A = this chain, B = another copy of it.
């Protein structure tokens, strides 16, 4: 494993709303829950910014995280991400927030504590470009 610092920004996290955790030993992603005080209505085509109540600090520049829709919410309810895929840089230390976009024709309710996205830690490579007149092998 790799250690990632997490700062709890809302006292509900770790009490009434669990920290993110891997469901199984074989899970690639961590479900991300929303930290809100009352149910949030998401109308068809609406985008709403939803706080998680946590911040992470990846720190290692060879690692990033991506935030993806949940498969069931996306397929069944059209509850996806307004920016489609979120990218979390190694030096990002702000609260994780979810751009929740309803692409469906049905109104949707997000309840406090609901899982609405997933977080996946991936290795990344920082490239150095070499400007060339023609590509070579």
Measured CB to CB, the residues of A under 8 A from B are: 1-8, 14, 19-20, 22, 24-30, 45, 47, 49, 55-57, 59, 61, 63-64, 68-75, 78, 80-93, 99, 101, 103, 105, 118, 120-137
A4 neighbours in B (Cβ, 8 Å): 127-130
A6 neighbours in B (Cβ, 8 Å): 129-132
What is the oligomeric copy number? 3
Q: Supply 27 A–B pairs (Cβ within 8 Å), ascending by A.
A: A3-B127, A3-B129, A3-B130, A4-B127, A4-B130, A5-B129, A5-B130, A5-B131, A6-B129, A6-B131, A7-B134, A14-B131, A26-B91, A27-B91, A28-B87, A45-B105, A47-B75, A49-B75, A68-B83, A73-B83, A74-B84, A75-B82, A80-B83, A80-B84, A82-B103, A120-B124, A121-B124
- Please measure, in the bound complex, the distance between the C-alpha atom of A70 and the C-alpha atom of B99, giving whole angstroms: 12
B125 in contact with A2 (CB, 8 Å): yes
A74 in contact with B99 (CB, 8 Å): yes
Across the interface, A24 reaches (CB within 8 A) one of B57, B91, B129, namely B91
Q: How far is the CB of A93 from chain B (nearest CB, A)?
A: 6
